[PDB]
Amino acid sequence: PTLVSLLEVIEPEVLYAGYDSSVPDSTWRIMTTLNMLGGRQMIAAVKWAKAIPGFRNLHLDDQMTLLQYSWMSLMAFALGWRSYRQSSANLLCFAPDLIINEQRMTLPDMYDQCKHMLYVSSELHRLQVSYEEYLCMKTLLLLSSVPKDGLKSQELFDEIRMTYIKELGKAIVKREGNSSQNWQRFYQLTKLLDSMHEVVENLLNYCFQTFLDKTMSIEFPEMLAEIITNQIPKYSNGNIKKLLFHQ
C-alpha cells in the first residue's frame, strides 16, 4: 500500500450539524451550532491522527501537543477542501445541513469570520489542488507547529515530517509537468501551507475572544474548551514554533 492511500482510507466521515433550517437564522445560533459541530470534528481528528503512519510512534505528549497546536489548521483546511469540492460558488460547507450561503453571509459578523476560510477554499480552487496533494498537505498541517524547545521525539518527528514532504512531492509529480513546473507547484502548495498559520491566527482571535467573554453566552463543547484552555497560555508565553517552508 502507498503512503498516500493509507492517508486516503482514514479520511473522516462527513458529520451533520443537526441544524433545523425551518427555525430562522442568527449569527449566535450559527456560531453555537458550529462550536458543537467543531468538538465532534476534533474527537474524529484524534481518531484520524492515531491512524496516520508514524504518528503513534511519537511520545504521547507530542501527540497531544501537535493536535492542540494544529486543531484549527486541520479544520479550516478540511473545510476549505470540502468547500472547493461542493462549490462552484464558493460557499462554506461546514455540514450538508449547514452551508454558509449568500444570505447567511449578510448576517452580522458572519463575513469577517468566514473570509479567511473562503481564502483557503479559493486558493485550493485557483491552484487546482488534487485529492492526493490535499491529503499530504493536511497531514503536513498536523506537523506545522512544535513547542519553542521542540518535541520529546523531535528526531523521529523531523523524519516523519520529511517523509510527508516527500509524499507531497510524489503527488505533485503525478501530474507532470515538467520539471521546473514541479518546482513551481511545490513552491505554490508549500506557500499555501505557510499561509495557513496566518489564516489560523485570524481564526483564533475570534475563537479566543468568544471563549473568554462569558457575557456573549457562546458555548464551546468540552473537547474545544480543553484545547482553547491549553492553547491560550502557550500563545501568551511564546511557546510556539510555526514551521515554515519559505522565509
Binding site: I43, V46, K50, L60, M64, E226, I227
Partner: peptide, 13 residues
C-alpha cells in the same frame, strides 16, 4: 489537565 484529549489518544479505537 487535558484529560479528554489524553483519554482519546490512550483508549483503544
Amino acid at each position: 489537565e487535558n484529560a479528554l484529549l489524553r483519554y482519546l489518544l490512550d483508549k483503544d479505537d
